[PDB]
């Protein structure tokens, strides 16, 4: 029934051997969880999606890992209610394609589409539209949760079991296995975006641009920022902002299938500064999803609360002066948070940086953790593999509330992961 497999997260880092159960049969999954519960709990079980977490949240050294990707039935889509009913192994690319002919858009897309619905709920994922749509869990109308006792619980965001619903959102698999969910989609009349592009010369400008009001005009917003240059070039950004196009905004060619989804010597001088400015400045460009959104290393992502703007500028300065060079860097302003205790996003300045593994890096990121903590921010568990229990607990002050929900639903510690043990969420 199960195979011994060396599993890792996407950062190809911290390997651990587990029994991997890979079955299309939901029955077998129920029986395997019963097999784990009866056998004195042991080192437990965790669900796995497409393995796109950089962390260790989808591995369980010496325990059971349940591969959820063969549970990938789309049960129903309804254009009138905007509801899709899917198995938790359905991925967001598959969902996106199935839903478009109904005029329905996946309401939160992350930077990849190769992500399961289960993983999208359990990490409470966010994307380019967070300030207008919130995160994934805001759009879940119901889910079916396989709990430790072997019962499948039907959960909704309001009414009884709300607490457990909200513990499962961002719960990293630790309340049990999400089998099935109903999601409310966003109505759209096209597969396209109308996009504006802006380019700033400085961090001060980047911040000014993001707090001048203009963010209200766009449903989707994010930036690539410079993390290497000295100040005041540092934190200069290519900003890309837009919204879903309506049919009347498309060039005539596209109106018949509006829902179809099918170095050099100059580059470091003044001319390329102009090139990159021109090329990155535009208004009302029509773009598909690939052009607008989806075109060794240690990923590190954090958010600093909105008011702590001076503290945010200080952390960027520390990154640049550190001697650790990050080329691919995403900046976004998050909007309001939801009610999930372990949900990562909070209103404020979100950054994802990417460091090549060098001497000293492990210790440098520890200092960064400390600064993020002091400034009221937190790290994202989907990107993290190395932070301590202490640091994590102080960054998520609702963790105790969460833990008691978890102990209520899982008394025998039937659901467990490397991360759980490391972060003392067990
Ligand atoms: C290139 C790239 C870009 C990314 N961009 C973004 C982004 O823009 N925004 C963002 O928020 N995230 C982003 N991520 C992270 C990714 O969205 C999350 O890590 C997502 O959770 C991965 O889903 P997955 O199905 O691979 O789940 P896995 O990585 O396999 O599992 C992740 C967690 O979900 C739990 N889980 C999975 N399935 C189930 C289930 N059926 N029931 C209960 N728990 C389950 C696992 O136990 C584990 O805790 C990115 C990742 C990559 C590689
Ligand atoms: C590749 C898609 O890029 C985007 O447009 N991203 C966003 O808009 C966007 C907005 C946010 F709030 S968080 C985010 N993206 C991320 O967190 C990514 N992390 C990686 C790591 C490796 C490769 C690609 C990515 S994208």
Numbering used by the authors: 7 to 268, 284 to 316, 331 to 461
What does the paper say about this structure?
Mtb Decaprenylphosphoryl‐β‐d‐ribofuranose 2‐oxidase (DprE1) is a flavin adenine dinucleotide (FAD)‐dependent enzyme, which together with decaprenylphosphoryl‐d‐2‐ketoerythropentose reductase (DprE2), converts decaprenylphosphoryl‐beta‐d‐ribose (DPR) to decaprenylphosphoryl‐beta‐d‐arabinofuranose (DPA), an essential cell wall component. When analyzing toxicity profiles, we noticed that many TCA1 analogs show inhibition of CYP2C9, one of six major cytochrome P450 enzymes which determine the clearance of 75 % of marketed drugs. Here we report the X‐ray crystal structures of WT DprE1, a TCA1‐resistant DprE1 mutant, and CYP2C9 in complex with TCA1 analogs.
KGaAThe thiophene ring is located in a hydrophobic pocket formed by Gly133, Lys367, Phe369 and Asn385 and accepts a H‐bond from His132 Nϵ2 (3.2 Å). Replacement of thiophene with other heterocycles or adding bulky substitutions resulted in reduced activity against Mtb (data not shown). Only a fluoro substituent on the thiophene afforded an analog (TCA481) that is 5‐fold more potent than TCA1 based on MIC. To better understand the basis of the activity increase, we solved the crystal structure of DprE1 in complex with TCA481. The structure reveals that the fluoro group forms a H‐bond with Asn385 Nδ2 (3.4 Å).
